[PDB]
Amino acid sequence: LKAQALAIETEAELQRVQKVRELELVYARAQLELEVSKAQQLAEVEVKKFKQMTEAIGPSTIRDLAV
Amino acid sequence: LKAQALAIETEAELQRVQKVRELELVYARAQLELEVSKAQQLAEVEVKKFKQMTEAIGPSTIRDLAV
């Protein structure tokens, strides 16, 4: 009888944990997408800032300005 | 009689542990997939940032700018 009651409570618990972890997986995937969009857009504006600045100053000036 | 009751409780426990570990394996696999997607997308945006920056500055400038 203990085995039967354990079977019932185990089946209910496993259905719950399955649904919870499935929706948690979907929301973590959406957080991943928003994170990588943030990272690539900030990286792109950093690259554009550096490129226009080192174009405006010229590489020959920074070749001997750091030393 | 102790052997028979041990057989019943052992069979119930092993069915429970089998189902629990199977769904835990599936969810750990899904976490692995999301992790490797995160790692490769952040690595790709890092590589693109470094490549465009070292293209904008030129390798001859960084050849003697670090020393």
UniProtKB/Swiss-Prot annotation, chains A, B:
Q: How is it modified after translation?
A: Phosphorylated on Tyr residues after EGF stimulation.
Segments crossing the lipid bilayer? none
Where is it made, tissue-wise? Answer: Present in most normal tissues. Higher expression observed in epithelial cells with secretory and excretory functions, as well as in cells chronically exposed to xenobiotics, such as bronchial cells and cells lining the intestine. Overexpressed in many multidrug-resistant cancer cells.
What induces this one?
A: Up-regulated by IFNG/IFN-gamma.
Q: Which domain of life is it from?
A: Eukaryota
Question: What is its subcellular localisation?
Answer: Cytoplasm; Nucleus, Nuclear pore complex; Cytoplasm, Perinuclear region
Domain topic, free-text comment: MVP 3 mediates interaction with PTEN.
State its role.
Required for normal vault structure. Vaults are multi-subunit structures that may act as scaffolds for proteins involved in signal transduction. Vaults may also play a role in nucleo-cytoplasmic transport. Down-regulates IFNG-mediated STAT1 signaling and subsequent activation of JAK. Down-regulates SRC activity and signaling through MAP kinases.
Summary of subunit composition and partner proteins: The vault ribonucleoprotein particle is a huge (400 A x 670 A) cage structure of 12.9 MDa. It consists of a dimer of half-vaults, with each half-vault comprising 39 identical major vault protein (MVP) chains, PARP4 and one or more vault RNAs (vRNAs). Interacts with TEP1. Interacts with PTEN and activated MAPK1. The phosphorylated protein interacts with the SH2 domains of PTPN11 and SRC. Interacts with APEX1. May interact with ZNF540.
Output this protein's name.
Major vault protein
Gene name as annotated: MVP
